[PDB]
Amino acid sequence: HMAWDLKVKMLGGNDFLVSVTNSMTVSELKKQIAQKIGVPAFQQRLAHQTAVLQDGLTLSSLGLGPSSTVMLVVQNSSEPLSILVRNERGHSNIYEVFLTQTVDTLKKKVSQREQVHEDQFWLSFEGRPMEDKELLGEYGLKPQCTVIKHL
């Protein structure tokens, strides 16, 4: 699958181009947009002549081509989502979070939900340790993902 450039229209009038392939998912496309412009993936909401693109969807399945324009919309406030947090016992719990929030907020929530103090446990996602000040969206937090609680 030869790589071809794609035209992306950033609401406001600005447009650019990023190289993609016929068999590239929407996640990888938003990642390339993050590398080109700097807006993180979780803030990217994409639309192709008002069709709403979903992560995990081949560009060929959408039929869009190197004369097709995609509208990009940054989501300043994302609607909430649910994630799972295991323990040493492995019992997953449900937590409603916003991707624009800090990990310290989640640490406070689980800190008052299990009584463990903030400075006695640390959270990890996909093996990557979650920083205390970083936004959750910078970890690629999908709905119903599993966040692991340590210590």
Domains in the chain (CATH in brackets) are: 1-76 (3.10.20.90), 77-151 (3.10.20.90)
Would you give the DSSP letter of residue 48? E
* C-alpha distances in Å from residue 69, one per residue of 10, 18, 24, 146: 10, 12, 16, 35
Residues 6+ positions from 119 with CB-CB distance below 8 Å: none
* C-alpha distances in Å from residue 150, one per residue of 82, 99, 107, 124, 128: 20, 21, 12, 7, 12
Secondary structure element (H or E) that encloses residue 47, with its range: strand 44-48
Nearest C-alpha neighbor of 34 from the set 78, 65, 70, 74: 74
As to burial, measured by CB atoms within 10 angstroms (0-12 exposed, 13-18 middle, 19+ buried), residue 44 is buried
Model resolution, angstroms: 3.2
Count of residues in the chain: 151
Q: Residue 41: CA atoms inside 13 Å, Cβ hemisphere, count?
A: 17
Residues 6+ positions from 63 with CB-CB distance below 8 Å: none
CA dihedral 68, 56, 13, 6 (to 10 degrees): -40
